[PDB]
């Protein structure tokens, strides 16, 4: 009953907050959540976004932001490779 509720709240919290490791989670599934949240905060704070912009040396800052956005999806590596 109680654990059974914890299963439903597992489904709800997983739905809202996306990745939540339940019991068995592949390193590909979880590391993707890591990358997504790290990039999420790098672009999310105007602070760290301004920082990565200069240290990277891009011509504009939104290039870095939308870069991180694109970098969230896995295929973006091969996309850069095809440029």
């Amino acid at each position: 009953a109680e654990k059974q509720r914890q299963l439903k709240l597992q489904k709800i919290y997983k739905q809202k907050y996306i990745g939540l490791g339940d019991e068995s989670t592949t390193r590909e599934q979880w590391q993707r959540n890591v990358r997504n949240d790290t990039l999420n905060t790098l672009q999310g704070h105007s602070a760290s976004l301004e920082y990565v912009s200069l240290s990277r040396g891009d011509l504009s800052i939104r290039d870095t932001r939308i870069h991180l956005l694109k970098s969230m999806s896995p295929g973006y590596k091969a996309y850069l490779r095809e440029e």
Binding site: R32, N36, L69, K70, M72, S73, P74, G75, A78, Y79
Partner: peptide, 10 residues
């Protein structure tokens, strides 16, 4: 942009 995909699709 799709988060989970085999290819990059915007």
């Amino acid at each position: 942009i799709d988060n989970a995909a085999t290819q990059l699709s915007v």
